[PDB]
Design a binder for this molecule. Structure first.
Ligand SMILES: CC(=O)NCC1(c2ccccc2)CCOCC1
Length: 284
């Protein structure tokens, strides 16, 4: 079926939970043996969210190459994304090592450091220009260059230096700051505006390594971001945009990381975002 009318048909019939459970039943199951090794317990935020072995990002290190991060490679859309958990106190150096080694231009953050009164990820970037951060375990230096605070999101320019080689690179930090502590946003308008700002920066384009996207577990909000982006790109590429099947795209992405889209409300919000986004692209 088309999307917008499949949408109204699920709303009127109140069957979002049944649709979402079908997705959960059909999703791929692949091994994640490296994630479950005892030496990696303090590298995982949640025991039930792990990268598959076949798609995990490897650190360029011979001691321990493990990080909780996955490469999502979308062949028809010609887009790739790295989806990862919010960094932990003992993985902030690994996180920036990955950004460096994978040649990423942008980092997309969809959570606040504290939500619901608890810590959802480490404070992994510097908050003042004159107070830089040094990660001694991976030999990197990170400096805040500029910060632009808007009503729904903040964009930061960061300098990452590889202290071994003295090479430097500019990294863009895109921080969506207004996702509610409970539920999903009422309108997708600010989320779509944010997606378009990431696109306009070049961070999603083939001349760079894959964008790094995270929330707390790296599967819920993070899944919504890449699902919406890929669906809108396919609607632009194909002769028949009504052929794009958001459930099929989501199942393809779940071949590369488990659990993408965590609730039926996140599934409905993804439909809403793609539907509204397709009107703004055109031609409008
Ligand atoms: C190489 C280059 O063009 N550097 C430009 C600046 C920069 C530095 C590092 C990260 C991002 C931006 C831009 C504004 O700050 C001053 C330097």
């Amino acid at each position: 079926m088309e999307m917008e009318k499949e949408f109204e048909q699920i709303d009127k019939s109140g069957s979002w939970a049944a649709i979402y459970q079908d997705i959960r039943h059909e999703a791929s199951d692949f091994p994640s043996r490296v994630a479950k090794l005892p030496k990696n317990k303090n590298r995982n935020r949640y025991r039930d969210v792990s990268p598959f072995d076949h798609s995990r990002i490897k650190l360029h290190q011979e001691d321990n190459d493990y990080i909780n991060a996955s490469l999502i490679k979308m062949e028809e859309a010609q887009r790739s994304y790295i989806l990862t958990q919010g960094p932990l106190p003992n993985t902030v150096g690994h996180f920036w090592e990955m950004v460096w080694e994978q040649k990423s231009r942008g980092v997309v953050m969809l959570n606040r450091v504290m939500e619901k009164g608890s810590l959802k990820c480490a404070q992994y970037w510097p908050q003042k220009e004159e107070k830089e951060m040094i990660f001694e375990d991976t030999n990197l230096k990170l400096t805040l260059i500029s910060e632009d605070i808007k009503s729904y999101y903040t964009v930061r320019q960061l300098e990452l230096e590889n202290l071994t080689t003295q090479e430097t690179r500019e990294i863009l930090h895109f921080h969506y700051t207004t996702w509610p502590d409970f539920g999903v946003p009422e309108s997708p308008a600010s989320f779509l505006n944010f997606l378009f700002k990431v696109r306009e920066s070049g961070s999603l384009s083939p001349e760079h390594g894959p964008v790094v996207v995270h929330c707390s577990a790296g599967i819920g909000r993070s899944g919504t971001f890449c699902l919406a982006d890929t669906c809108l790109l396919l609607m632009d590429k194909r002769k028949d945009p009504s052929s794009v099947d958001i459930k099929k795209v989501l199942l393809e992405m779940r071949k590369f990381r488990m659990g993408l889209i965590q609730t039926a409300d996140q599934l409905r919000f993804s439909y809403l975002a793609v539907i509204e986004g397709a009107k703004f692209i055109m031609g409008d």
